Amino acid sequence: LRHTFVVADATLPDCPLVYASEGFYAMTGYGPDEVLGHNCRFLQGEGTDPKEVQKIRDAIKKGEACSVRLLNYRKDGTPFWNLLTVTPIKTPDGRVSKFVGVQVDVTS
Numbered sequence: 001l002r003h004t005f006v007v008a009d010a011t012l013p014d015c016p017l018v019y020a021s022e023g024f025y026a027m028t029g030y031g032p033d034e035v036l037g038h039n040c041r042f043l044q045g046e047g048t049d050p051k052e053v054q055k056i057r058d059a060i061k062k063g064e065a066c067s068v069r070l071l072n073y074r075k076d077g078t079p080f081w082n083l084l085t086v087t088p089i090k091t092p093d094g095r096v097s098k099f100v101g102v103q104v105d106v107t108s
């Protein structure tokens with residue numbers, strides 16, 4: 001039902017976020033001044049499973065949509081489960097331009 005959504009700029013090497021819904025900011029606890037121009041890998045931490053992470057990277061590198069479940073931590077430290085889904089956006093000539101991801105706090 002509910003879920004946040006963001007846009008990452010693939011034209012840039014590190015895939016920084018260039019847009020985030022109001023839910024993303026509220027959920028994560030960070031403000032646009034702290035997220036724009038960055039990679040949401042900053043929401044990851046100790047419990048975060050590096051193997052799951054390793055899957056998004058590859059999907060991205062390979063430029064394929066992908067969904068995985070990762071443990072993320074809000075700005076206050078409180079952790080939460082993130083059911084993330086990443087989708088690539090290719091130009092008419094096949095090249096990838098942006099990446100779109102939909103986050104969902106499935107902490108149940």
Ligand SMILES: *[C@@]12=NC3=[C]C([C])=C([C])[C]=C3N([C][C]([O])[C]([O])[C]([O])[C]OP([O])([O])=O)C1=NC(=O)[N]C2=O
Nearest residue numbers: 008039040041043044053056057070086099100101
């Ligand atoms: C972040 N959501 C998110 C949304 C998009 C559109 C993309 C492309 C990536 C993410 N990430 C994954 C992260 O940026 C990175 O791709 C992986 O960490 C693998 O690369 P590294 O170089 O860091 O090993 C998001 N990850 C999250 O944990 N939370 C989000 O909301």
